[PDB]
Amino acid sequence: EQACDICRLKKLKCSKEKPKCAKCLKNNWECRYSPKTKRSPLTRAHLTEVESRLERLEQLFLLIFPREDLDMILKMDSLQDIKALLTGL
Amino acid sequence: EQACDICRLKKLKCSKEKPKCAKCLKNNWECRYSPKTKRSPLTRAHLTEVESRLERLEQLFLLIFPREDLDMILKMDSLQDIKALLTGL
DNA sequence: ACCGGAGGACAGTCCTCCCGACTGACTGACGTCGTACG
DNA sequence: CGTACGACGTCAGTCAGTCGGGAGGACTGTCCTCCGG
Ligand SMILES: [Zn+2]
Ligand SMILES: [Zn+2]
Ligand SMILES: [Zn+2]
Ligand SMILES: [Zn+2]
């Protein structure tokens, strides 16, 4: 089943043979089969672990700071910004 | 297709007839077909939105509580109590 | 009766991969200028 | 001097190649019902 890295990236049929394969072989490229990427399980128990801890950190957050701040953090991607937020106390 | 509240809790086969079904007519029972109860979507995109929020709060709380059992706190249910606690900031 | 879990239709993932559109390059054709000849 | 021919340059059109939206579909895991112990 698994297509080689390059065929994946390019989205063309892979011959998939061993070691290399038609277009990496032909075209002159180093053909690889990368490991599947580890992702979190998409189960319902796990979505619920995570929604319900996020909820409880939100509940605790609100005893400490205003709701308007909740909404800012819940969007920040930068670690300086998450820290500065906290520094304006 | 939908089974009745009761056949649902008792786990027996439901006749499904409306308004009152098999048993619920028999045992002269309060027969409800309660509406289809919502869950949040199990999709990858939504698992991931929620995991990004949780990470950001998780990070914000590493700085509020650099010292431990945040989990102790996360389990409490009382608002006064939690706030009595935190005022040991 | 009661309820753990089998059974199965279904929701949605998460792969590989075919196909269409868009961009770039190459070739051809036309037009304009310059030179040569009358 | 004037006209004609050739050569070069520029523009347009067509073809090919590549990134991309996403169809196809096996599969993971859900989430019902209700069997039978
Ligand atoms: Zn390949
Ligand atoms: Zn390859
Ligand atoms: Zn019923
Ligand atoms: Zn009923």
Curated annotation (Swiss-Prot), chains A, B:
Name of protein: Regulatory protein GAL4
Residues where Zn(2+) 1 binds: C4, C7, C14, C21
Subcellular localization: Nucleus
Coiled-coil parts of chain: none
Superkingdom classification of source: Eukaryota
Binding site for Zn(2+) 2: C4, C21, C24, C31
DNA-binding region: 4-31
Assembly, per entry: Binds DNA as a homodimer. Interacts directly with the mediator subunits GAL11/MED15 and SRB4/MED17.
Transmembrane parts of this sequence: none
Entry's free-text remark on domains: The 9aaTAD motif (residues 862 to 870) is a transactivation domain present in a large number of yeast and animal transcription factors.
Coverage span on the entire protein: 8 to 96 of 881
Effect of P19L: Loss of DNA-binding
The organism of origin for this protein: Saccharomyces cerevisiae (strain ATCC 204508 / S288c)
PTM comment text: Association between GAL11 and GAL4 may serve to expedite phosphorylation of GAL4.
Note: Present with 166 molecules/cell in log phase SD medium.
Its job: This protein is a positive regulator for the gene expression of the galactose-induced genes such as GAL1, GAL2, GAL7, GAL10, and MEL1 which code for the enzymes used to convert galactose to glucose. It recognizes a 17 base pair sequence in (5'-CGGRNNRCYNYNCNCCG-3') the upstream activating sequence (UAS-G) of these genes.
